[PDB]
Design an enzyme around this catalytic site. Structure first.
Site, PDB file in Angstrom:
ATOM      1  N   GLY A   1       0.807  -1.203   0.000  1.00 15.90           N
ATOM      2  CA  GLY A   1       0.000   0.000   0.000  1.00 15.90           C
ATOM      3  C   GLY A   1       0.846   1.261   0.000  1.00 15.90           C
ATOM      4  O   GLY A   1       2.051   1.253  -0.248  1.00 15.90           O
ATOM      5  N   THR A   2       0.175   2.375   0.297  1.00 17.45           N
ATOM      6  CA  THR A   2       0.804   3.683   0.155  1.00 17.45           C
ATOM      7  C   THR A   2       1.210   4.280   1.497  1.00 17.45           C
ATOM      8  O   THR A   2       2.362   4.696   1.664  1.00 17.45           O
ATOM      9  CB  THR A   2      -0.143   4.637  -0.573  1.00 17.45           C
ATOM     10  N   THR A   3       0.292   4.334   2.460  1.00 14.11           N
ATOM     11  CA  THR A   3       0.488   5.173   3.633  1.00 14.11           C
ATOM     12  C   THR A   3       0.172   4.406   4.908  1.00 14.11           C
ATOM     13  O   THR A   3      -0.604   3.447   4.905  1.00 14.11           O
ATOM     14  CB  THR A   3      -0.385   6.432   3.566  1.00 14.11           C
TER      15      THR A   3
END
Lengths: 234, 234, 91, 247, 182, 207, 176, 235, 104
Positions: F28-30
């Protein structure tokens, strides 16, 4: 009697407070032939009597040089003698290379007594059965370190170890005031040393093939005399 | 001459291994028979009490690989580790050569293991003995037996454990080579019934297994054990 | 150059870590403590021979204070018994 | 010095001296018993308090190996404690992190028996002087109550009693046990049986009792993701032991 | 140049290679290989040693399929920590237990396939232009030998280099047999 | 033993050739963790359990973040059963830092660890090769910068659980969303998803 | 060689799971859990042998066949081994849990990150196009025969293809 | 003094190794005879109980290579493992060197292995004495060596080991003339059969025979019943 | 010392060669003597290889006795190799230009 219940190994003490196993190792020196050493301010001399198995055989090497400034004589167990002599030679070379410095006589003596002592603390290993006289000359003057397998090392003007050595020791005790002052005359010092060992003999006479002499000094690098060379000193 | 397993006695015999051979004689009887069309394993479980969970215990027999089974006598704790090693070895052979382990090679490995612990002084002999049974294209059905000494032997019908002599005599008297599994079962049950110290040898006292007909290896649960025991009419 | 960079250091991580720990203990607690600890370790390893179970001694875990810890070297652990006897005794 | 002669060797009668002596040491140990019920297991033991000054809490004779398995012993306590530590480490390293789930009682009992066995035949270690009752629940085998001896021999039971009160408690269980026992009657039978071996004070501070029953989400510690089941092992407190004992 | 060809037929397995490059593993199984000198031959003789050790231990020759599995496993073990070094192998033999000749190929990565016919080197794409058409699993051993002769003829057609002439080894119920150059 | 390197040379050779290396899964990203007056909330775009009330969110390689987190979770379980007392976050941080240092960052994990223990609430971060940081609010991953911006534009002392959840979700979405909330003295709550050609031949194969 | 990179697809419907391969098969079974693999021939063969070994040992030790979720964890843990030297594989596992009775499907990456799903899974070459053509072609809760038709069509819409239909107590292999 | 391997007896013996050698006397009789160009090994198989499976593991005499044969008496379990190590060494030599193992080399290796298991007190010496025999690779000279638990080994024209060994050895001493050893295979086999018949009262079912010939040829007979009869006719 | 006429009197080497100019005769438990002779030959061949010159008999004798010394600590601090001393004694014979024919 009870000694037989506590001498089985190097570890067990006895209720008397003794340690018989290393006592036997010390006693083992009495089986070896006499070897004598004496000190003078300029020179220190070794005198030893070589034993041969039979008239058909050659005589043993009682004196070993380690460097041009020191060497040693020994009595007692042949294997332990070989081991200690080789270890001391190895360490002398190690000191001379790693430090570019001649190994000091007292330094070598303690370095070797430390090795000899460790075997008396651990099971399985046995105490060494070789008494030896380290002799050498260096910046600090002439030295003669008696050695005993039980880590004990002391600097003596002279001494005798091996079978019937106490007679030579008595003669050295009676001439200590004399032979020390003979510094500056190596022939006379060697003659005194030989006259010391002569008291230790009960059967055989000193001869060019059994007797062997070593000398070291400020002007004399460690040298070994044997064969016809020692005729003039007999 | 038995405190150490590494030392022979003056008569050229090992007392430690002979004691182990004595040990397995105390364990419950385990009996195996080879028929013309399958192998049958039976075993009387020494441990018994009304509270023991017979439905899942199955500690008297073991499975090593498809079409290979063993009955054990002696210490269950010692049996477990060898059984585990046998399973690992069989699966490793299958992984390597992609063929099922010929039971002889397995028995060779386990016999070597059991010998090995008779070798190193810190290792006591395995107090167990196995009846091996299995199928392979090399020889079809065959029964192998291995003792703590680490040896093995092929058999048509054998018994192991308590009163092994009586069971061996009964087998030697009654056995035939043309028997089939459904009759070898009757023979084995009769032998156990006449070898046991129990009055009637109820189904609880008994653990059972068989290999027959590619080849189906089946270990019977107590319900069908009772059904068979009444089928043969003990 | 052909090896994975982490290979050389990780291969002997446990033994070098123990050596460093013993060095620190010698610096702080004198020669006696490393002597005692190393002698415990060697007297445990020497006496425990059991070729079948590669799992390892329990007391080895106890003395290393890893009796309540797990490492990847623990999760993912000529082989005959007699070869092991030869190797262990050095005979 | 690179080898040590095995401590355990066969007597001329085919028995093992150290194993029998360890079993005797187990016999002299304090009583401990367990009962397998239809829908649960109960394991209990007496606390061998040296003096009333000992904190009962720290004498945690029963201890959980996994949220599904609980063990109690009789005999040499320190051996049991070290063995439990090793057993928990094994239950995690050998099974959970490979297969991703806690081991069933059968496999864990086999592993612990393996630890005990290798002690039986070694150059520098005596056999452990304990026998463990290992109750627990399996997702397939259901509730089970395994016993393991010093030699490593293990075999399941519906009820047992190991130690000083072994014989009398076992004979009493042999008469009281029945097939359709509910857990709330298994606890009653265990408490009544233990009363036969207990001498002196018999209350919530002298008997440690643990039961492997239904899931207890209250003990799980986190909520959501209901896929994770609450621990089945459940130690009973002294107050609840007194309540259960009062009737 | 180093090349190997192998054709399984209803009665036999025919192996051929340019000159050596071949080691017998048992009375009814033999192995042929290619690859850089030294390493490949070292591995081949190691395999021969292990297979003969097993044969002596069990006093029973080993089926070609089991030998192929063992060879693949040992190649995967050898490649475990070094450059793959590009070894290629063929294994043929008479599965006397099941009475069917079998031919297996193994590649440097450690794969194995029960090819009816195979090759390595230059012959991996040429002589397939002929095998694709002429080959059948029903023919007799002599027809297989004739097909191999035609394959080497095609190799000569494609190669201006002075081809050395391959040695032909056959394995039947009679065990490994050498055939004079042809 | 351990994470064997028994194919590194073969993998390099294959990569040099045409054989394409299959790619490892990302994470994922964050990620964000927000400490609040009576607990700490950790949010991600999956979370990993170390202990009932010790939770982790892992950026980087999913396999590594799962493996290391689960291993230290098992180890802390052994620790807690060993000392018979509640585990505490600082021990997890020490273990994670020592572990990721041992492998020198070749284990691609960038973890946020938060939990509550007898000393109160805790929140930390672990980079590769042991670089660690602590703070009231933290974020990791590619989209972490916008989430941070939101956090320091909104976070304040003494905010309660509802505001903590709101802020965490807003920070994540500023980069589904699943968030875990730990409350001192109460169970941790995992809030998931908070935001004729068929020519045939037939046979039976034995089970 | 054409032997590497074969497609593998797994799909689940009502009371059954379907796992299919685009062809030396690449779908292998232990107990009742089926494992489809894509990647290098060496890695697929070695993983087959190793998993057969481990699952047979598990079966013998437990006296119980291994369930698909436990097998999923086992394969993930195995693939994590050699983390620094991963296998070149994209395996897919499918099966029917015996006790709870729920069908199960799960994918992986080369390191063993379980990419679980319960609608369908694809892996191997053209994974994206296959995923699209299956999503546009898949429906839930299909009957076993409709499931077989759907998976066969999915593979056809990507010769040699093998498809397994796995029931509670019976499995039907089929070649297309 | 007998308590350990590491201590000499006062007269110079090592009683433990001597006890092991005596244990070698426990096993069944085995004998080997060197002919002019063939070597015959006979073994007294323990009288088989009728429940034993004759078709499997019948032979104690076993192969170490295409051109070498090993026979033994004493503890069978140790013998199997010693044979296994011998086979391992033979194949290792074939690998490291193109030429196979010389029989002298193989017997030296087995003697070394037996000696090495006597160097330390931690391991029991093998209670076995092997009778390695065979023909050197591509060389016609027959070779026959005996090994002992102490590691001492020597080559013999004929030698016996195991139970009731003295009776056989004395018989061979009288009947074997080194000036004219039995040349043809039949004569050597008859001599071996006669030698064993002085110990094995049981019929031919107990006597196994192995014939090894130059050029890597080994064969085990199942027709010595005729040879047994002929000796009966001569008796 | 042929125990029986059946033994091959031609194949019991109580006399062996160590080098071209150096051989020896042995007695006692030949098992240890085998290791001793092997060590002597290894030392001689290694010396000739390294220094491209004949091995002096005294050096070889010292090397052999060093192996014999290993029931305890070795001449260079090596750990003990065996639990017992050799039950073998031998006499070496050879020729060296600096020593002539000599027997140790």
């Amino acid at each position: 009697m009870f000694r037989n219940n506590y001498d089985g190994d190097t570890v067990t003490f006895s209720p008397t407070g003794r340690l018989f196993q290393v006592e036997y190792a010390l006693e083992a020196i009495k089986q070896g032939s006499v070897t004598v050493g004496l000190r003078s301010n300029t020179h220190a001399v070794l005198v030893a009597l070589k034993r041969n198995a039979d008239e058909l055989s050659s005589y043993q090497k009682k004196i070993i040089k380690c460097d041009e400034h020191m060497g040693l004589s020994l009595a007692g167990l042949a294997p332990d003698a070989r081991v200690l002599s080789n270890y001391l030679r190895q360490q002398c070379n190690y000191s001379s290379l790693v430090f570019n410095r001649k190994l000091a006589v007292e330094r070598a003596g303690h370095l070797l007594c430390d090795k000899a002592q460790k075997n008396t603390q651990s099971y399985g290993g046995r105490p060494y059965g070789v008494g030896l006289l380290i002799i050498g000359y260096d910046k600090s003057g002439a030295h003669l370190l008696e050695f005993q397998p039980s880590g004990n090392v002391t600097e003596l003007y002279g001494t005798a170890i091996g079978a019937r050595s106490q007679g030579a020791k008595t003669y050295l005790e009676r001439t200590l005031d004399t032979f020390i002052k003979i510094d500056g005359n190596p022939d006379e010092l060697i003659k005194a040393g030989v006259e010391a060992i002569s008291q230790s003999l009960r059967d055989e006479s000193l001869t060019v093939d059994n007797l062997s002499i070593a000398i070291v000094g400020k002007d004399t690098p460690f040298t070994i005399y044997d064969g016809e060379a020692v005729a003039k000193y007999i | 001459y038995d405190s150490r397993t590494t030392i022979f006695s003056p008569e050229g015999r090992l007392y430690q291994v002979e004691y182990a051979l004595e040990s397995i004689s105390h364990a419950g009887t385990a009996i195996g028979i080879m028929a013309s069309d399958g192998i049958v394993l039976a075993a009387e479980r020494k441990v018994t009490s009304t509270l023991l969970e017979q439905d899942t215990s199955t500690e008297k027999l073991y499975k090593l690989n498809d079409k290979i089974a063993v009955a054990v006598a002696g210490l269950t704790a010692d049996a477990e580790i060898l059984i585990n090693t046998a399973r690992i070895h069989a699966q490793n052979y299958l992984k390597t050569y992609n063929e099922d382990i010929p039971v002889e090679i397995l028995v060779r490995r386990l016999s070597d293991i059991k010998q090995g612990y008779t070798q190193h002084g810190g290792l006591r002999p395995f107090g167990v003995s196995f009846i091996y049974a299995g199928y392979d294209d090399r020889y079809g059905y065959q029964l192998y037996t291995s003792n703590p000494s680490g040896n093995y032997t092929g058999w048509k019908a054998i018994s192991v454990g308590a009163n092994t002599s009586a069971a061996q005599t009964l087998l030697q008297m009654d056995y035939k080579d043309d028997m089939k599994v459904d009759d070898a079962i009757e023979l084995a049950l009769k032998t156990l019934s006449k070898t046991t110290d129990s009055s009637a040898l109820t189904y609880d006292r008994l653990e059972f297994a068989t290999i027959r007909k590619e080849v189906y290896q089946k270990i019977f649960k107590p319900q069908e054990i009772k059904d068979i025991l009444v089928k043969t009419g003990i | 150059n052909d090896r994975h960079p982490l290979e050389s250091t990780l291969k002997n991580w446990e033994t070098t870590q123990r050596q460093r720990q013993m060095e620190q203990y010698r610096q702080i607690f004198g020669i006696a403590e490393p002597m005692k600890r190393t002698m415990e370790m060697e007297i445990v390893n020497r006496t425990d021979f059991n070729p079948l179970s590669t799992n390892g001694s329990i007391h080895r875990d106890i003395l290393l204070n890893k009796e309540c810890s797990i490492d990847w070297e623990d999760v993912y652990p000529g082989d005959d018994v007699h070869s092991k006897i030869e190797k262990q005794l050095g005979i | 010095d690179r080898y040590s002669f095995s401590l355990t060797t066969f007597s001329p009668s085919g028995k093992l001296g150290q194993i029998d002596y360890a079993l005797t040491a187990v016999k002299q140990g304090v009583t401990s018993l367990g009962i397998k019920a239809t829908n649960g297991v109960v394991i209990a033991t007496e606390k061998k308090s040296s003096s009333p000054l000992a904190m009962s809490e720290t004498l945690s004779k029963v201890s959980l190996l996994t949220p599904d398995i609980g063990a109690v012993y009789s005999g040499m306590g320190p051996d049991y404690r070290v063995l439990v530590d090793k057993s928990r480490k094994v239950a995690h390293t050998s099974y959970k992190r490979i297969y991703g789930e806690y081991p069933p009682t059968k496999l864990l009992v086999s592993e612990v028996a393996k630890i005990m066995q290798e002690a039986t035949q070694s150059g520098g270690v005596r056999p452990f002087g304990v026998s463990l009752l290992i109750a627990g629940h399996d997702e397939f085998n259901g509730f089970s109550l395994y016993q393991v001896d010093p030699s490593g021999s293990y075999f399941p039971w519906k009820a047992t009693a190991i130690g000083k009160g072994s014989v009398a408690a076992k004979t009493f269980l042999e008469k009281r046990w029945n097939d359709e026992l509910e857990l709330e009657d298994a606890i009653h039978i265990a408490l009544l049986t233990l009363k036969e071996s207990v001498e002196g004070e018999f209350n919530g501070d002298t008997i440690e009792l643990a039961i492997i029953g239904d899931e207890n989400p209250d003990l799980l510690g986190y909520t959501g993701i209901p896929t994770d089941k609450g621990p089945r092992f459940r130690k009973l407190t002294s107050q609840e032991i007194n309540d259960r004992l009062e009737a | 140049m180093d090349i190997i060809l192998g054709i399984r037929v209803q009665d036999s397995v025919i192996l051929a290679s340019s000159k050596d490059k071949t080691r017998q593993l048992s009375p009814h199984t033999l192995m042929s290989f290619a690859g850089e000198a030294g390493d490949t031959v070292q591995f081949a003789e190691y395999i021969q040693a292990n297979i003969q050790l097993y044969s002596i231990r069990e006093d029973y020759e080993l089926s070609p399929q089991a030998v192929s599995s063992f060879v693949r496993q040992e190649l995967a073990k050898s490649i475990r920590s070094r450059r793959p070094y590009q070894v290629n192998v063929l294994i043929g033999g008479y599965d006397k237990k099941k009475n069917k000749p079998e031919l297996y190929q193994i590649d440097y990565l450690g794969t194995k396939v029960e090819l009816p016919y195979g090759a390595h080197g230059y012959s991996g794409f040429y002589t397939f232009s002929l095998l694709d058409h002429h080959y059948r699993p029903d023919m007799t051993t002599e027809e297989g030998l004739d097909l191999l002769k035609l394959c080497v003829q095609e190799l000569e057609k494609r190669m201006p280099m002075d081809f050395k002439g391959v040695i032909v080894k056959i394995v039947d119920k009679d065990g490994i047999r050498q055939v004079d150059d042809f | 033993a351990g994470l064997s390197f028994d194919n590194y040379q073969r993998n390099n050779f294959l990569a040099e050739n045409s054989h394409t290396q299959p790619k490892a899964t990302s994470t994922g990203t964050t990620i964000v963790g927000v400490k609040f007056n009576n607990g700490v909330v950790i949010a991600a775009d999956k979370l990993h359990r170390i202990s009932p009330k010790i939770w982790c969110a892992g950026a980087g390689t999913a396999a590594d973040t799962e493996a290391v987190t689960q291993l230290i979770g098992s180890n802390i379980e052994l620790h807690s059963l060993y000392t018979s007392r509640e585990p505490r976050v600082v021990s997890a941080l020490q273990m994670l830092k020592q572990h990721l240092f041992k492998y020198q960052g070749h284990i691609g994990a960038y973890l946020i660890v938060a939990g509550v223990d007898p000393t109160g609430s805790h929140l930390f971060s672990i980079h590769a090769h042991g670089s660690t940081d602590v703070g009231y609010y933290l974020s990791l991953g590619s989209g972490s910068l916008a989430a941070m911006a939101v956090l320091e534009s909104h976070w304040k002392q003494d905010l309660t659980k509802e505001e903590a959840i709101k802020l965490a979700s807003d920070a994540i979405q500023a980069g589904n969303v699943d968030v875990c909330v730990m409350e001192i003295g109460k169970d941790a709550e995992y809030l998931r998803n908070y935001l004729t050609t068929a020519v045939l031949k037939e046979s039976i194969v034995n089970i | 060689s054409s032997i590497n990179g074969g497609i593998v697809v797994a799909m689940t419907g009502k009371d059954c799971v379907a796992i299919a391969c685009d062809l030396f098969e690449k779908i292998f079974h232990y107990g009742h859990v089926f494992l489809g693999i894509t990647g290098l021939a060496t890695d697929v063969t070695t993983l087959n042998e190793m998993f057969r070994y481990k699952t047979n040992l598990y079966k013998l030790k437990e006296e119980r066949a291994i369930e698909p979720e436990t097998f999923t964890q086992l394969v993930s843990s195995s693939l994590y081994e050699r983390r620094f030297g991963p296998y070149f594989v994209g395996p897919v596992v499918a099966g029917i849990n015996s006790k709870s009775g729920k069908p199960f499907i799960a994918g992986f990456d080369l390191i063993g990150c379980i990419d679980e799903a319960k609608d369908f899974i694809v892996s191997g070459t053209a994974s994206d196009q296959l995923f699209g053509m299956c999503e546009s072609l898949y429906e839930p809760n299909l009957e076993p025969e409709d499931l077989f038709e759907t998976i066969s069509q999915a593979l056809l819409n990507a010769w040699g293809a093998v498809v397994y239909i796995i029931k509670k107590d019976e499995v039907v292999k089929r070649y297309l | 003094y007998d308590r350990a391997l590491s201590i000499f007896s006062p007269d110079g013996h090592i009683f433990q190794v001597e006890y092991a050698l005596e244990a070698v006397k426990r096993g069944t009789c085995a004998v080997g005879v060197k002919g002019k160009n063939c070597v015959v090994l006979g073994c007294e198989r323990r009288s088989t109980l009728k429940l034993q499976d004759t078709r499997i593991t019948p032979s104690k005499v076993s192969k170490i290579d295409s051109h070498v044969v090993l026979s033994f008496s004493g503890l069978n379990a140790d013998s199997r493992i010693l044979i296994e190590k011998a086979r391992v060494e033979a194949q290792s030599h074939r690998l490291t060197l193109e030429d196979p193992v010389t029989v002298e080399y193989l017997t030296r290796y087995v003697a070394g292995v037996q000696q090495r298991y006597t160097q330390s007190g931690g391991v029991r010496p093998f209670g076995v004495s092997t009778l390695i025999a065979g023909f050197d690779p591509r060389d016609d000279e027959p070779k026959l060596y005996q090994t002992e638990p102490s590691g001492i080994y020597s080559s013999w024209s004929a030698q016996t080991i195991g139970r009731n060994s003295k009776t056989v050895r004395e018989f061979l001493e009288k009947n074997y003339d080194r000036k004219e050893p039995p040349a043809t295979v039949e004569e050597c086999v008859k001599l071996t059969v006669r030698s064993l018949l002085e110990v094995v009262q049981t019929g031919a079912k107990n006597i196994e025979i192995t014939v090894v010939k130059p050029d890597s040829d080994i064969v085990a007979l199942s027709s010595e019943e005729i040879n047994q009869y002929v000796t009966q006719i001569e008796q | 010392r042929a125990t029986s006429p059946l033994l091959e009197s031609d194949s019991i080497e109580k006399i062996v060669e160590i080098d071209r100019h150096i051989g020896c005769a042995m007695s006692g438990l030949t098992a240890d003597a085998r290791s001793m002779i092997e060590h002597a030959r290894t030392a001689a061949v290694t010396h000739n290889l390294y220094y491209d010159e004949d091995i002096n008999v005294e050096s070889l004798t010292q090397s052999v006795c060093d192996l014999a010394l290993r029931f305890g600590e070795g001449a260079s601090g090596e750990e003990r190799l065996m639990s017992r001393p050799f039950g073998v004694a031998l006499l070496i014979a050879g020729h060296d230009a600096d020593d002539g024919y000599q027997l140790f």
